[PDB]
Amino acid sequence: VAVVLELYGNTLESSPVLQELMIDLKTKVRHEIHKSKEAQRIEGMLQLLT
Amino acid sequence: DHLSKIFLTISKSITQNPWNEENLLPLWLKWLLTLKSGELNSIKDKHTKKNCKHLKSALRSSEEILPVLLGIQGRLEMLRRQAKLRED
Amino acid sequence: ISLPNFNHFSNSVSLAWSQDGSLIFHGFDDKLQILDFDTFKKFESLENTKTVSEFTLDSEIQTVKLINDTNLIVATRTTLNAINLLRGQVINSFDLYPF
Amino acid sequence: HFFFTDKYKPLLFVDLISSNELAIIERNPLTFHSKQKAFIQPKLVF
Amino acid sequence: VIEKLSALDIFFKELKIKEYISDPGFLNKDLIFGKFSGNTFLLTHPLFRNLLSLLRLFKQAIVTCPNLPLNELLEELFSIRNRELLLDISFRILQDFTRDSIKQEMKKLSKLDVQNFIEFITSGSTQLFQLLSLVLDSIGLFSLEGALLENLTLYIDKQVEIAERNTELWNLIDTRALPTYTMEYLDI
Amino acid sequence: VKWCLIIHGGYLVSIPNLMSTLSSLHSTLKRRSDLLPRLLALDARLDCTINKFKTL
């Protein structure tokens, strides 16, 4: 996705549907951000309990 | 190139204060980057890029800091939950 | 598994294996270690005859090789040293700086 | 003194609409309406 | 060299007057006796008696001392001098010793110093944060103040947000034909 | 898992083989944490181009 956007930057603007595809992608990847950060918290208390 | 000089000053200040709790300087920086990254890269070749690698080294140190910090955040949260169970 | 977590990094690491498998020499940058194999812990001797397992060396250790269960030759980035194992006594030493 | 512009290679009609309004009537032949299905001859780009 | 040290090339001359890959390669090929007799040149030897080294050159030891015990290193770290020694000796202990060894050392270590350092860090560095993880793991889960917990909580929250947007900006710096009609001009 | 660790932490302190009894958990969470940083880099690239074409 990074290389496809780095190539098709402005075409993202020209094409409308790809923009909201990106929007839902941002939403879900923020959800995964939260998942991964909670996993890091999991790291924390497991390292405590061990 | 007034924006370039602003970029230079902002980068110098950010390097001097890597752990500044303010957000105005980072947000000005990130608008400036997300608008004019290419012309930024084409401005200069030696001094601006050397400052860029200085700041990037600082930022990578911060990124290295981040995960242990999140772990201690989870430690604090679970200790809070433990205190809640203690009082209940 | 013996899993230390050292902040620094230096690929100048080597290990040698006692022919009976009791102990493992570990040449780490500026340090010699002898690890018991039964538990991956330090070579603890109850008699305490200064046959310790933490030997300081001048440079990064390149090789550590036991010719038998009695003689150990260690080659660090500046020199080489031949030592005994039953007794912690050095016997030989030669230089690698000129060459 | 005179001049000639190369900004308009496809052009059908050049005229004066008014005292100072020119009209340049061009074409976009292939890019707009034909859209002809052409034989694939790929470029080895790598 | 042994005779010169007992009676006390550049290093030998300096020792005689006072009485480093090349230097270690020429002075490390007896060594214990020379070190005992010596106890500049000491810095080079440390570059090239753990209780004596701990009791003792301070920066030279904390950066390049061969033998350095956990108890004295944690005492030196737990001194509140704070001349960047926090980072230096946090790096030194994480370079020298294991996570469980540091855990048990802090188990031995008294809780008053632990609380003092939590207060100091919350008031005014990944080595330091790893050390915070280690000290929380060693104190465990029972004995710890709720108020200090909340102070550390807000401290860590502002720190996680600053690290997050720092990482974001780090990666950020790491980064048809003419229309149907155009309203165009012309020169003469 | 969070509530399990919260309400039975002491038993986990007492048990001798923490790795031997939570190796699978450890693998899952370790791979998630390893996913974290590249994911955040992707987020930065994303919102970069996002704001770029939103303003233009």
From Swiss-Prot, chain B:
**Extra remark:** Present with 20000 molecules/cell in log phase SD medium.
Question: What are the transmembrane regions?
Answer: none
Main role? Involved in nucleolar processing of pre-18S ribosomal RNA. Required for optimal pre-ribosomal RNA transcription by RNA polymerase I together with a subset of U3 proteins required for transcription (t-UTPs).
| Gene (name only) | UTP9
* Assembly behavior: Interacts with snoRNA U3. Interacts with MPP10. Component of the ribosomal small subunit (SSU) processome composed of at least 40 protein subunits and snoRNA U3. In the absence of snoRNA3, forms a complex with other t-UTPs. This complex can associate with pre-18S ribosomal RNAs.
Highest taxon listed in the record's lineage: Eukaryota
The protein, known as: U3 small nucleolar RNA-associated protein 9
Q: Which organism is it from?
A: Saccharomyces cerevisiae (strain ATCC 204508 / S288c) (Baker's yeast)
| Localization annotation | Nucleus, Nucleolus
From Swiss-Prot, chain C:
Taxonomically, the superkingdom here is Eukaryota
Signal peptide limits: none
According to the record, where are the WD repeats?
7-47
Location(s), subcellular: Nucleus, Nucleolus
Q: What does this protein do?
A: Involved in nucleolar processing of pre-18S ribosomal RNA. Required for optimal pre-ribosomal RNA transcription by RNA polymerase I together with a subset of U3 proteins required for transcription (t-UTPs).
Q: What else is known?
A: Present with 6560 molecules/cell in log phase SD medium.
Q: What does the annotation say about its assembly with partners? A: Interacts with snoRNA U3. Interacts with MPP10. Component of the ribosomal small subunit (SSU) processome composed of at least 40 protein subunits and snoRNA U3. In the absence of snoRNA3, forms a complex with other t-UTPs. This complex can associate with pre-18S ribosomal RNAs.
Q: What is this protein called?
A: NET1-associated nuclear protein 1
- This chain's source organism reads Saccharomyces cerevisiae (strain ATCC 204508 / S288c)
Residue range from the parent sequence = 599 to 697 of 896
Curated annotation (Swiss-Prot), chain D:
Where, per UniProt, does this protein localize? Nucleus, Nucleolus
Give the top-rank taxon of the lineage listed in the UniProt record for this protein.
Eukaryota
Q: Tell me, what does this protein do in biology?
A: Involved in nucleolar processing of pre-18S ribosomal RNA. Required for optimal pre-ribosomal RNA transcription by RNA polymerase I together with a subset of U3 proteins required for transcription (t-UTPs).
Oligomer status and interactors? Interacts with snoRNA U3. Interacts with MPP10. Component of the ribosomal small subunit (SSU) processome composed of at least 40 protein subunits and snoRNA U3. In the absence of snoRNA3, forms a complex with other t-UTPs. This complex can associate with pre-18S ribosomal RNAs.
More info = Present with 5440 molecules/cell in log phase SD medium.
Please give the name of this protein: U3 small nucleolar RNA-associated protein 4
Q: Which organism is it from?
A: Saccharomyces cerevisiae (strain ATCC 204508 / S288c) (Baker's yeast)
Q: Report where the shown chain sits in the full-length sequence: first residue, last residue, total length.
A: 731 to 776 of 776
UniProtKB/Swiss-Prot annotation, chain E:
Places the protein is found = Nucleus, Nucleolus
Q: Which domain of life is it from?
A: Eukaryota
Functional note: Involved in nucleolar processing of pre-18S ribosomal RNA. Also has a role in nuclear tRNA export. It acts between the steps of tRNA maturation/aminoacylation and its subsequent translocation out of the nucleus. Required for optimal pre-ribosomal RNA transcription by RNA polymerase I together with a subset of U3 proteins required for transcription (t-UTPs).
Q: How does it assemble?
A: Interacts with snoRNA U3. Interacts with MPP10 and UTP25. Component of the ribosomal small subunit (SSU) processome composed of at least 40 protein subunits and snoRNA U3. In the absence of snoRNA3, forms a complex with other t-UTPs. This complex can associate with pre-18S ribosomal RNAs.
The miscellaneous remark of the record is: Present with 16800 molecules/cell in log phase SD medium.
The name this protein carries in UniProt is: U3 small nucleolar RNA-associated protein 8
* Organism, as annotated: Saccharomyces cerevisiae (strain ATCC 204508 / S288c) (Baker's yeast)
The organism's taxonomic lineage, starting at the top: Eukaryota, Fungi, Dikarya, Ascomycota, Saccharomycotina
- Part of the full-length chain shown: 460 to 713 of 713
